[PDB]
């Protein structure tokens with residue numbers, strides 16, 4: 349874990365040039381950087397506008413990601429830490445962006461989307477049981493999945509991780525387990541729920557914002573998928589991402605099987621959700 353100064357990260361990012369910005373939120377701006385010639389992502393927290401939340405997310409991500417290692421996780425190269433001036437994570441640069449941009453001839457066939465599901469599941473199995481304590485990510489969603497130069501997926505953004513020991517919901521809320529959204533209850537099952545929602549979005553092309561129907565009742569993405577799956581393969585076909593090639597019986601059948609796993613992941617009661625190892629097992633069986 350290398351420590352960097354402001355001047356080093358300024359030089360690496362061409363004085364934090366607007367043209368080097370590869371990601372953005374209220375809390376951080378992510379820049380492409382080049383250090384000996386190593387290409388990196390510089391995630392710079394918004395100290396000036398949100399000092400307290402910046403500090404919490406910075407410390408959480410640094411403490412968590414510095415102790416973890418797995419091929420389907422983002423990798424921390426180092427950090428800068430100068431109170432009032434800069435707090436930043438230096439991460440391995442993922443040249444193919446994030447899954448949200450990938451979703452929203454196309455390479456994203458059914459088999460390739462299933463491969464991403466398997467890669468993310470490996471990352472989450474590692475988080476939940478590969479380290480000395482369970483780590484709950486708490487913000488699993490496509491914009492927190494990065495893509496390699498080999499298009500290998502990696503779980504990123506540990507600013508909300510916990511170590512144990514029109515639309516109905518907009519923004520982030522649609523990915524959140526009800527007990528986490530309403531009560532801030534944290535268990536590995538909240539990642540399982542978010543994984544299910546992610547798979548649903550990956551295969552339908554739909555953000556989990558849901559819709560409020562004319563009688564005022566919300567139709568969640570889970571309920572939409574549940575209705576489609578219950579109507580068989582033709583029901584599933586009607587709900588799949590229209591930009592995705594679905595021509596063979598095998599591709600439709602695989603998509604149907606992912607959505608059925610995704611529905612178990614996104615069950616309302618945490619105790620009815622599988623653990624990620626069981627999820628991974630189902631996805632590995634479908635991969636053969």
Ligand SMILES: Nc1ncnc2c1ncn2[C@@H]1O[C@H](COP(=O)(O)OP(=O)(O)O)[C@@H](O)[C@H]1O
Pocket residue numbers: 370371372373374375376377378389391422439440441442443445446491492494504505507
């Ligand atoms: N290591 C990286 N390599 C390439 N792009 C990245 C990397 N980390 C983040 N990004 C881009 O920046 C966006 C925001 O990153 P994230 O860590 O989620 O910040 P925030 O916590 O503020 O959302 C990501 O969705 C992705 O597009």
Ligand SMILES: [Mg+2]
Pocket residue numbers: 487505507
């Ligand atoms: Mg975040």
